[PDB]
Ligand binder design. Structure first.
Ligand code: FES
Length: 141
């Protein structure tokens, strides 16, 4: 009975909703068209971490943009808001050098798919068990 159910019906493009789950923040960002295009423009060979870090799919999956979102359209990016270096909360709203998140504790920069691009963090922000259960609700867990 750990699962929770998040109403995302009012989340507009370019907005991140932050919810607490298992004691930690989950970021739910409805990505803009720029975020999506930029995420899909990155080659796997450019990435620090090529693993999708995604609980919903094979653990060996590649960190393509398509393997980082809940939907095929790429609008819904759901991830743990927990820096993979030492666990600080990354700052969003298109922050840092790669149009995503910036962790100010030791300067890690994540891209528009939450992938690590610069700084001490070793891994992409992990993606929780998450799925839409209708048009307006994401089940986490
Ligand atoms: S905790 Fe994020 S850069 Fe160190």
């Amino acid at each position: 009975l750990a699962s929770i159910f998040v109403d995302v019906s009012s989340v507009e493009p370019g907005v991140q909703l932050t919810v607490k789950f298992l004691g930690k923040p989950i970021f739910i960002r409805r990505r803009t068209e720029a975020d999506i295009e930029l995420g899909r423009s990155v080659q796997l060979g450019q990435l620090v971490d090529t693993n999708a870090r995604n609980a919903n799919i094979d653990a060996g999956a590649e960190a393509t943009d398509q393997n980082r979102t809940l939907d095929e359209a790429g609008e819904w990016l759901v991830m743990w808001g927990v820096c993979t270096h030492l666990g600080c909360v990354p700052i969003g709203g298109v922050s840092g050098d790669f149009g995503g998140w910036f962790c100010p504790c030791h300067g890690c920069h994540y891209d528009s798919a939450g992938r690590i691009r610069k700084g001490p963090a070793p891994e992409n922000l992990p993606i929780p068990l998450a799925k839409f259960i209708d048009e307006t609700t994401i089940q986490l867990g």
